[PDB]
Amino acid sequence: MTEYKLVVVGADGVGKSALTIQLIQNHFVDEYDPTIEDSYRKQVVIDGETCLLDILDTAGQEEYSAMRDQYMRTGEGFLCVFAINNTKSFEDIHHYREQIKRVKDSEDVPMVLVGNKCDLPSRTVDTKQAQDLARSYGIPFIETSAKTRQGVDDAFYTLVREIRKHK
Ligand SMILES: Nc1nc2c(ncn2[C@@H]2O[C@H](COP(=O)(O)OP(=O)(O)CP(=O)(O)O)[C@@H](O)[C@H]2O)c(=O)[nH]1
Ligand SMILES: [Mg+2]
């Protein structure tokens, strides 16, 4: 059975854990419990292929920035999450992508840009600006909501397809 090592990254508060818990448990976490590092191994069917998703839910707190090198070396694809109502989280995406490229020593790393919290009306990052950033990276861009489940399945499955298509 093929395994896909997925890593969810992004600034503190963007909804990394809420996206992961919505994907696996089908419910929305309203609480904010900062993550250190959690892992989930889930069997799923994607495009008729039974596979194992090994998902790492990482810390956004800049205090745990030393743990990044290890998960960037082992991770096969990265879900780079920003929140559409947090401009700092959108600007921080560049730092996550640069560090991934440096650790992998490659500009072609499976990655998906995710604009989370699309259910909120307090938007500060234009969809067009995020689309333009993802185009400049050569990667897919998907808007998601861990509350409504909009784009959640699409974001994770698109990342698996990027790992499967880089292969
Ligand atoms: N409205 C809305 N709120 C969300 C969404 N995703 C997460 N949140 C909220 O944002 C807060 C932080 O979510 P959380 O999943 O812990 O974010 P995180 O990126 O994992 C935080 P850390 O980096 O410290 O692990 C929570 O209150 C959660 O309910 C979303 O899509 N929509
Ligand atoms: Mg978290």
From Swiss-Prot:
Alphabetical list of InterPro entries matching this protein: P-loop_NTPase (IPR027417), Small_GTP-bd (IPR005225), Small_GTPase (IPR001806), Small_GTPase_Ras-type (IPR020849)
Subcellular localization: Cell membrane; Endomembrane system; Cytoplasm, Cytosol
Positions carrying N-acetylthreonine: T2
Impact after mutating V14I: In NS3; affects activity and impairs responsiveness to GTPase activating proteins; characterized by a strong increase of both intrinsic and guanine nucleotide exchanged factor-catalyzed nucleotide exchange leading to an increased level of the activated state
Enzyme class, UniProt record, top EC level: hydrolase
An annotated GO BP: female pregnancy
Record PTM text: Acetylation at Lys-104 prevents interaction with guanine nucleotide exchange factors (GEFs). Lysine-depalmitoylation by SIRT2 promotes its localization to endomembranes in endocytic pathways.
Its EC number(s): 3.6.5.2
GO CC terms of this entry: cytoplasm; cytoplasmic side of plasma membrane; cytosol; endoplasmic reticulum membrane; focal adhesion; Golgi membrane; membrane; mitochondrial outer membrane
Residue(s) carrying N6-acetyllysine: K104
Superkingdom, natural source: Eukaryota
Alphabetical list of Gene3D superfamilies matching this protein: P-loop containing nucleotide triphosphate hydrolases
Keyword Lipoprotein: yes
Gene Ontology MF terms: G protein activity; GDP binding; GMP binding; GTP binding; GTPase activity; identical protein binding; LRR domain binding; protein-containing complex binding
Catalytic reaction annotation: GTP + H2O = GDP + phosphate + H(+)
Disease linked to the protein: Leukemia, acute myelogenous: A subtype of acute leukemia, a cancer of the white blood cells. AML is a malignant disease of bone marrow characterized by maturational arrest of hematopoietic precursors at an early stage of development. Clonal expansion of myeloid blasts occurs in bone marrow, blood, and other tissue. Myelogenous leukemias develop from changes in cells that normally produce neutrophils, basophils, eosinophils and monocytes.
Record NCBIfam families: small_GTP (TIGR00231)
Role played: Ras proteins bind GDP/GTP and possess intrinsic GTPase activity. Plays an important role in the regulation of cell proliferation. Plays a role in promoting oncogenic events by inducing transcriptional silencing of tumor suppressor genes (TSGs) in colorectal cancer (CRC) cells in a ZNF304-dependent manner.
Name of the protein in its database record: GTPase KRas
Source species of the chain: Homo sapiens
Lineage: Eukaryota, Metazoa, Chordata, Craniata, Vertebrata
